[model samples]
Target: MKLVIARVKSPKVKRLSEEDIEKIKSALKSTNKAVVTIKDENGEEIEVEVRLLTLEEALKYINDLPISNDAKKLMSNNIHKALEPGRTVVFGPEGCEERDKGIIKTFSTDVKLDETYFFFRV
Candidate 1:
């Protein structure tokens, strides 16, 4: 599989305005090519680009991301895994040998990934 790196430009959960959330949602719904870029703690530019593509294409692209047979099963647990049996939910890899292997973009806390606002447009 191609090595897919999930670099953190900033904590996923960053302060955002309500308007920002709506804007993101709109972009996801309408734009097939939306790139969300932000700065990380080190002031690096990190980007999360979103595109609407078929599962086949996504699967191919994901081959480049950080995922393994075992990791796939773990990440895709719960409702998401059941609904998208063929697809994998990309995430950071912690508590595993891959932790320092540059496979995941680990943050200090879940808040980093959770606090981030989405789809709010001001």
Candidate 2:
């Protein structure tokens, strides 16, 4: 058996926008908790902490948001799908282009400005 020592490196946290926090809150209601891993602008790997929710959890949480049930469902579905394994979630035109190039699969949801996208590359 090979012994592997776990590194106790502190996580580097970055601030999130209000819209980003809202989306994460909704996602947290469904998945309870999730990790978002991505490369920074410099192409360095970074892991971000995010809350996740399920379809029902998100809909209930956003019940008073003044959006249609269908829209809520769409959001919930996108969040849930993005957080799952073997899936890639991207936002922005560049990310979409990457998806189109078969670099990563997407959840078909529009990305907000500066929103962190998630992807699985193995």
Candidate 3:
């Protein structure tokens, strides 16, 4: 199994205005669920779709980024371990939830892999 990382850019929900908070309270009074449209960084409507990156494509993809030698070595050395079931590759902070759901995933090489993102076998 191989994992591909997709950076789904979305806006951050920092704070809610008084009127917006009141609106939520009013909506809560109704039984129906409330739906919100979260926009992307470019103000476009949030959209999502699944895409695949073959292992060959994924491996070469890393070389294009400015990643550390050790980081690349750690990944290249233990890629198989990462592909095993119940394993998780703590790539970037982008799609951790989806990464945790599988054995293989990719992260931005721009982000250095610190101690907190190391791997362990049980």
* Candidate number with greatest lDDT: 3
Q: Give a tens-digit lDDT track for model 3, residues 1-122.
A: 34432222232322223453344335434422243333434556532211234455545644543557655665555544545555545443331211343334454444353222322121
Question: How well does candidate 1 score on lDDT at residue 47?
Answer: 60
Candidate number with the higher TM-score (1 or 3): 1
Backbone collision count in every prediction? 21, 10, 0
Tens digits of per-residue lDDT, candidate 1, 53-91, equal 443444444445444554333332311221222222234
Give me the displacement of residue 54 in model 3, in angstroms.
Answer: 2.1
Sliding window of 10 residues with minimal summed lDDT for model 2: 1-10
Off by over 4 Å in 2: 1-47, 58-85, 93-112, 119-122
Query: What TM-scores do the predictions have?
Result: 0.37, 0.31, 0.36
- Compared to the true structure, candidate 2 yields what TM-score? 0.31
Q: lDDT score of model 3?
A: 0.38
Count of backbone collisions within predicted model 1: 21
> lDDT per model, in order?
0.34, 0.37, 0.38
- Better by lDDT, candidate 2 or 1: 2
lDDT of 1: 0.34
lDDT of 2 by residue, 39-83 (tens): 444656555554343445444553543444554444445544433
